[PDB]
Copies of this chain bind each other. A is one copy, B any other.
């Protein structure tokens, strides 16, 4: 501006969200045909107001996303990978029969999916079953991933996305067969599951869609174990030794009985399975997305924070009514704790009915054995994985001061004025950096004298095979330890002898 007065000249950046763009989270899932986004191609997603138009209405992805936006408003930038539905997929169809007629006034209340799809209608006396079904179908929220239609008192719910992802709604929470103060007397409900899920997509093309496009958290909104295996292979190949790394981590789930869930696991150290019971009220991918989003959005610059507990691991965007049986029995809870499975439970004990909110125990990965079949707990905590990535990057940025520096091996007597160095001085400097990060990246140590080794290529390769300039840095570390294992030995003493 020429019209200004002073000389200090402000130039505001074109757009905000600078804070993010370092914690990119990729949500992968299916979409309907209403959306205008190209299938099988990652696309940035700015805000929430234009996901229905882009990824189809009521789809799986336009519903996971929604939870990624609900969980944390800002801090991350989300990228969608929409996947077209399968070719020969057949949508699952449940039905819901309503039998009347009504005799007294009241309200009809239902809880399908989560609390955002709930329905609450008014019913007068003398209303017939067909009218009740009509009002219910007219009041079901259109974002519920189930196209609802009415016919002569039978409500047909057809999944919007074909595949097995439609087979995860089997705990509908009605208000019709009890004595709550508001209850149309003479009406009953019946659930069915007429048809069922079908074949699922199996993409296996991550190399092409995202190859050098390093992400932080991959959320998977499907249950096909083979798709989860392809995602795991991708993240593993991203944690490789050959090509420069783009460290990431994936969040999938596994719903079923105890044996089915223990069978769906493996030594996969790159995923964090979420074990969900057979009678879970909420659709599973919703709570999976909430967990993944909280993990991706809270541990941006704090990579040691364990996402677990009623404060740091609370999923505010999930609201369940409590249940008479507590899902996983405590025995199964411990069973899953042991076999590298995440477990979520209700936070408050509110009693039957009485909406609540789930939180996460043991924010751990699905890692329990090493490469040589040696029981380990290095990569068990999902925070240890992020710490390993952060220490890799930190050491890589620290060691840049030796790029192009003159090095003196075989004489180790840098003359007066040279700006060189030698392996012992480099080892001293590196070891000082290491024991300087004690508390932020590493534990105390065990023996720093034989933990950090700096050898030259001239003494690793066989004779007349080494090259000048190449080094070999071997470091063995331990992430910061937490907690203790106190052994109380309480014992009274009636006698006294001062």
Contact = CB atoms under 8 A, between A and B. Distances in A.
Interface SS of chain A:
loop
Contacts of A375: 48-49
A245 B3 contact: yes
A9 B9 CA distance: 43
A241 interface: yes
Interface in A6-40: 6-16, 18-19
A391 to B, nearest CB: 9
Contacts of A247: 1
Given A239-B12, A372-B15, A244 B7 contact: no
A11 B241 contact: yes
A382 to B, nearest CB: 15
B18 A476 contact: yes
A493 interface: no
Given A47-B374, A393-B2, A245 B10 contact: yes
Contacts of A241: 10-13
Interface of A: 1-16, 18-19, 46-50, 214, 239, 241, 244-247, 369-376, 378-379, 388-389, 392-393, 395-397, 399-400, 403, 450, 453, 474, 476
Contact of A397 (B2, B14, B18, B19): B2
A399 B47 contact: no
B372 A49 contact: yes
B49 A374 contact: yes
Protomer copies: 2
A370 B1 contact: no
Given A1-B245, A4-B244, A12 B388 contact: yes
19 contacts: A1-B214, A1-B247, A3-B244, A3-B393, A3-B396, A4-B244, A7-B399, A7-B400, A8-B396, A8-B399, A10-B241, A10-B245, A13-B241, A18-B474, A46-B373, A46-B374, A47-B374, A49-B373, A49-B374
Given A18-B474, A49-B374, 13 more contacts: A1-B244, A3-B244, A4-B244, A7-B403, A12-B239, A14-B378, A15-B371, A15-B372, A18-B450, A18-B476, A47-B372, A48-B375, A50-B373
Count chain B CB atoms within 10 A of each CB in A8, A241, A389, A403 and give the residue with the most: A8
Contacts of A11: 241
Given A8-B396, A8-B399, A48 B453 contact: no
Given A244-B4, A369-B49, A396-B3, A14 B376 contact: yes
Nearest to A50: B373
A1 B246 contact: yes
Contact of A46 (B372, B389, B397, B403): B372
Contact of A400 (B8, B10, B18, B49): B8
A373 B10 contact: no
Contacts of A15: 370-372
